[model samples]
Target chain A: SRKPLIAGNWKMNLNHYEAIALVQKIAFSLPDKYYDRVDVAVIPPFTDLRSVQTLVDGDKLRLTYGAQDLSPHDSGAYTGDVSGAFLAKLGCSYVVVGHSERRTYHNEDDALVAAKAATALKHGLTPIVCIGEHLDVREAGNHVAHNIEQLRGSLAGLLAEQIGSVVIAYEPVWAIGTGRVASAADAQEVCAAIRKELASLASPRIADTVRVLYGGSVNAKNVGDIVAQDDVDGGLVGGASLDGEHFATLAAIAAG
Target chain B: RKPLIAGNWKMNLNHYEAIALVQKIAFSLPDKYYDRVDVAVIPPFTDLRSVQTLVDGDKLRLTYGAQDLSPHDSGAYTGDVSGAFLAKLGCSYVVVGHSERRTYHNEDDALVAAKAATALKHGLTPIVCIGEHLDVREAGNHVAHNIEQLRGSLAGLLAEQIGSVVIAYEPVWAIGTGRVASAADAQEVCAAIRKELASLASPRIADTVRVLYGGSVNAKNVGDIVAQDDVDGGLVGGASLDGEHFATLAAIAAG
Candidate 1:
């Protein structure tokens, strides 16, 4: 069985000071039992990593941390880009690659995402590879095909063994903040397609071992249904993750 | 007029490292040099708060800002630093569109213009970067190319709004190894910018405003570049990372 993982993608929010406060709040509320079964992580902006590192190290908190993104290159001449090497040096356990925000804003494509993933693995950091379909694609009923192709592109150069460590999050673009929750059946459909395609790209064993998360307006209110699906291992929480109590509740349910 | 030299700490140093380096520069500068010349550190976004904290606590004369700003004000444009957020952190300036951003990130003149306007509205002065690549320079079209970009970057702003803005003319080819631009070459572009500055604003505004020569700026050539009538200072990159070298450039500019 896949161990459920819940990660908060604090996209472009929280400076170092605010990030420290939130990290502490989340750490204080969770007990030992939660950390034992489920993996909990916070992906903050690059600027806040050091503050998170200091707090996590000082308190010996069981919290895992990473960046919202990383550069494909190890170093040199890429301005405004956070290198994977730097993220690993900061004690980051994971990194989010190819998030929808990145694709839309930064013009990140499949090749760029794959190269970034390779860079993350080079520095011993796990990449949370995100794949999804836009609203137009979903309307045309090509959402599943669109995501499968994107998944293939994202996993292009990875070794089959390495695939086990990659966390794939399927976030429906339209559902992100639409306030319309994706049905549990919708979650299963996309998550299952991902698992099948993941197997072909890697192996059945790797596919089965790897975790596929369902994101898009997921909260404590709708998460119980999301986690109950067969292939849906966990979630990539957005707005709901901002609230400590609400985030804690969602994580607890996923753990059980 | 006080010469302004801003460091483009492009993709280098974290918050803690920024504190150590910036402290060295602030502590090292003599009041004579500090008053004679204006020095600013443009660190990455993450380091801004720590920098703001340090500058505020010590009342260090060192001004600090970011290397870039988001085109959008707010709402769902992830991975961008907002001008609004920067102003709240006590930032006095922000680099609009550097060549590095234009080349690597596809930043165009229009986007740079919008960012400059946004920065101005938030009480942050926009450092608009204009430069030419090797091909344009080699083709003898460098000055024209740079002017065109300057025209586009300055298109939307009025003469009143333009007085406080800083324009840096950095030849991209000059940054290539062993082919650095001569101080004369930098002055030529900076001089053209000043000439156009008169037309866009006025002769008085052009003189009051600062036009800088960026790239390959070092202690050895810092004095030479600033000594030119057109060139005010530099937007120092690699050499600026060193506290002593950067301070040396400031001293040279001040003199």
Candidate 2:
């Protein structure tokens, strides 16, 4: 069975100080036993990574951490972008790529996301590639095919071995941070479709090993049913992940 | 008037290298250099927290900032840093709309204006970047082109906000190409920028704003660049990655 993973995408929130406190709190709440059942991680803003790394290392915290995003280039002349090499240096094990907000706000296309995912893999970091259909696409009844297309483009050029380690999150644009969530069935349909797509891209064994997550407004109360789906592995948590107690509780619920 | 030598390290340097380079830069300069010149470094976002810790702990005279920030103040913008977070991190300056961002990230003049205003709202001085490409320079419209960009980029700010902002003119062709703009070529555009600033706001506010020249700036040519009538200093690039080279340029600008 794939280990349940609950990775918080702390999107553009928290400075180094708040980051330190939050990581410490979450670490204290989620002990070693929890790691055996599930993999816990936080994807903080680029500014807070070092502080998070220091706390994780000094306390020998079991929970791992990662970056919110990285530049497509490894280094040089791309101002304002963090490099995957730098993330590796900071001990980041994962990196989020192609989140809906990036696609909506920053004009990120699947082509760019493909390059970013490749870059992350090159530096020995797992890419938690986020793919989903917008509200318009979902309303038009083309959500599954649309997301499958995104998955193909976003994970382009990865081999079966590489694809097995990548975590895929299905986050519909309209539901994120809006207090709305895809129903458990709604999540499973897309996640199952994503697994099928992955199977075509790599192999059945690789697809089965790869973890598929649900991400729109996931919380402690709703996560259990969400995780109960045959294809749904865990969550790429948003707002609920802000509170250490709440996130730990949500992780515990997913574990059961 | 104190000159500012701000290093935009682009995307180079990790946190470990960041700490070492910053320490070397600070160690190379004496206390008198800080008084004579306002030196700052713009590191990649991943290195800012480490840089903040070092600067705060040692009480270094040097200041630092990020290469970019999100247009939104806060909330739900994944991978975008908020100005409030930067303010909390003790950032004194931020580079808004560098040519690389404009060319690659599709940042336009209007978005740049919003970013500049956001920086000021968070109590950070925006080093507003404006420049033209080689075609415009060849067509002799570089002056007008850059001035128009300046007008659009600073449109969101008030006259009071204008004086607190820093303007950097980086000719797109010259950036990272090892081609420094001729001192006179730099002065021409910078003077036109100052002239435009006066008309947009007021003569008094325009005079108070510092206009820096960017693109392949080094110690060999910085003295001549800063000696120009309107050019206040430089936004050092490749040279900034090396501690001794940047400090040498700072000392030259200080003179």
Candidate 3:
């Protein structure tokens, strides 16, 4: 069975100091029972990764941490970009790729996401490849196919075993930070479709091993029902993850 | 007056390497070197906090900054760093509109203007970078092209704000390509930029602002580059990775 993973996308929030405090809170508040059942992670801004790395190492915190994004190139002349090699040195276990905000703001498309995903694997970091449909596409009845197409494009050149190591987060653009969330059944429908697409791209065994997540407006109250879906492994949390106790509570609920 | 010899580290080095480099840079410079030249290193975002701690504890004369910042001060933008966070980390300067950013990230001049203004709002000096591609240089319209980029990038900032801004003229074709612009070629565009600055604000503001020459700058060639009438200093690239190489370049700019 695929292990449940709850990774918080601390989207451009928290400085080094704030990140230290929040990570400490999350580590201490998470119950012992949840540790063995759930794989926990935090994705912070590139600026805070070093501090997070130090904190995790010093405390030997069970919680794993990662970067919100990384450069497609390993190094050299790309101004203002943080490289995957640097992220690897900082002890990042996972890196978020192709978040919708990046696609919207930075003009990142499927091809670039694939390059970044391949880059992440090169540095031994798992890429949480995010795929979703915009409001218009969803309203026009093409959400599942659009997301599946994104999934295929994002994983374009990866080997079957490499595809098996990847995690997928289906974050519908309309629902992200908009106080709208995909209903449990709705989230399951897309995630199930994604797994089916993965089956075609790789194999049935690879699809079964890959963890699929639901993101966008996830909180303690809604998380229980969302994680109840067969195909929904856990969450790629946003706002709710900012609060220490609320996130721990959500983690516990997902563990059940 | 002393020149600014800022090093744009440009996506190289981890925090471990960053600490070592910053220490080496600090140790190599004499106490007097700080008085004769202004030195800064623009490391990748991940290195700032580590650099800050070392600078603070040692009370090192070396200053540091970031390569880029978000146009928004703070909020829901993923993968973007805020100038507020940079300032809080004790950053005194932030690079905006670097040639690579313009080419790779679709950063238009207006967005550069917004980012520069945002940097100023957080009390950080924006080192606004403007340049021309090889095609424009080959077409002989490099002067007009760069000047237009300068105007559009500084479109909304006030004259007073422009006074504190630093401009780095990086010829796109020369950066990382080992082709330094001839000292005269560097001055020609820099001088034209100063003239445009005068027209935008006033001669006094233009005179007070520093215009730097970047791309393949090294200790061997930096002295003559700094000798140009309009060129204020060098934005050292690859040489900056070596602490001693950068320190030597800082010494040359001193004279």
lDDT for position B121 in model 3:
94
TM-score of chain B of each: 0.97, 0.97, 0.96
Model no. 3, DockQ: 0.82
lDDT of 1 by residue, B61-174 (tens): 989888888776654555566677788778888887888789888899999998899999889998999888778888999888989999998878989988989998877877
lDDT for A100 (candidate 1) = 91
Q: Per-residue error at A240 for model 3, in Å?
A: 1.2
Give the Å error, residue A83, model 1.
1.9
Q: Score the docking of each candidate (DockQ).
A: 0.41, 0.85, 0.82
The reply for model 1, stretches above 4 Å from the true place, is: A28-33, A174-181, B14-16, B23-31, B49-59, B177-179
CAPRI category for model 2: high
| TM-score, per-candidate, Cα-based | 0.91, 0.97, 0.96
Tens-place lDDT digits, model 3, residues B219-254: 678989999989989777888899999998898888
Worst 10 residues of 1 chain B by lDDT: B72-81
Go through the candidates in order and give the clash count of each.
0, 0, 0
Ten residues in sequence with the least summed lDDT for candidate 2 chain B: B172-181
How much is B180 displaced in model 2, in angstroms? 5.3
Model 1 score (lDDT): 0.83
Model 3, residue B19: distance off in Å is 1.1
Which candidate has the top score in DockQ? 2
